[PDB]
Symmetry: C2
Subunit: 153 residues, 2 copies
């Protein structure tokens, strides 16, 4: 796959469409799109393990972590594959997401197709919060919206 897409939905007002683009399989994945309905400021943004939305975002499981590492920010060597850090929403409640990551992929062992993108209630502390929770979820709080990441053209 060179392209994937995800429609984020939730219980509240948060919704958006996120694109993924991977020009070649050994390469960075570009992640971009708009999420609306977000409170101004930082929001945890992660690929979770399962593409299961039968119980809404809850059934997506934990951060996609095939290497069994601790939670970090996207720039850390120590991080979950699904750790994409934060996205920032402006004063009109919009996050114009623009991220490039070389750890996630659209194929192979780190492939994120069929898993769930989740945007969170609060800022991801990027594993720096000094508690156990920080090393697991970054303390990003509730799952506001999510969707299954699908193959696109």
């Amino acid at each position: 796959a060179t392209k994937a897409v995800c429609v984020l939905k939730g219980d509240g007002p948060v919704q958006g469409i996120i694109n993924f683009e991977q020009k070649e399989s050994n390469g960075p994945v570009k992640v971009w799109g708009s999420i609306k309905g977000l409170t101004e400021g930082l929001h945890g943004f992660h690929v979770h393990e399962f593409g299961d939305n039968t119980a809404g975002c809850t059934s997506a499981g934990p951060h996609f972590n095939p290497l069994s590492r601790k939670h970090g920010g996207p720039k850390d060597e120590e991080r979950h594959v699904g750790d994409l850090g934060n996205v920032t929403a402006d004063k009109d409640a919009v996050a114009d997401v623009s991220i490039e990551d070389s750890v996630i992929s659209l194929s192979g062992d780190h492939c994120i197709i069929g898993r769930t993108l989740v945007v969170h209630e609060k800022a991801d502390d990027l594993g720096k919060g000094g508690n156990e929770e920080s090393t697991k979820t970054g303390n990003a709080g509730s799952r506001l919206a999510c969707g299954v990441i699908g193959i696109a053209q």
Copy 2:
């Protein structure tokens, strides 16, 4: 992937949950679950190429057809990989789905993870309707509900 799941939703009343299981990478896939909101009778049931629900079911594209064959029934040799035939809705508008298929897979190229499962308005003629449309879509008509197929626990 040994397990997958799909939540079907549409613009109308049609909704359901379909599970997939594949014990061995070269074995058949079990497909089961339930869909409600369906008029009594036969309804086309296919995996469509793209897991793109930005336009709802419309953006999923045509039947998943990596081998460029003509539309057929699940037990034909000449079929699209995504061709899973008909589900049957009972008098109470519920289809109980129980299928086993040897052509789709949850890994490799015929992999349906991250593609879209669609339930159609009409009966799939399994490609024997004797017109062009039959060899493409089986004349199953509109897309009543769909979801992206995701990796499950």
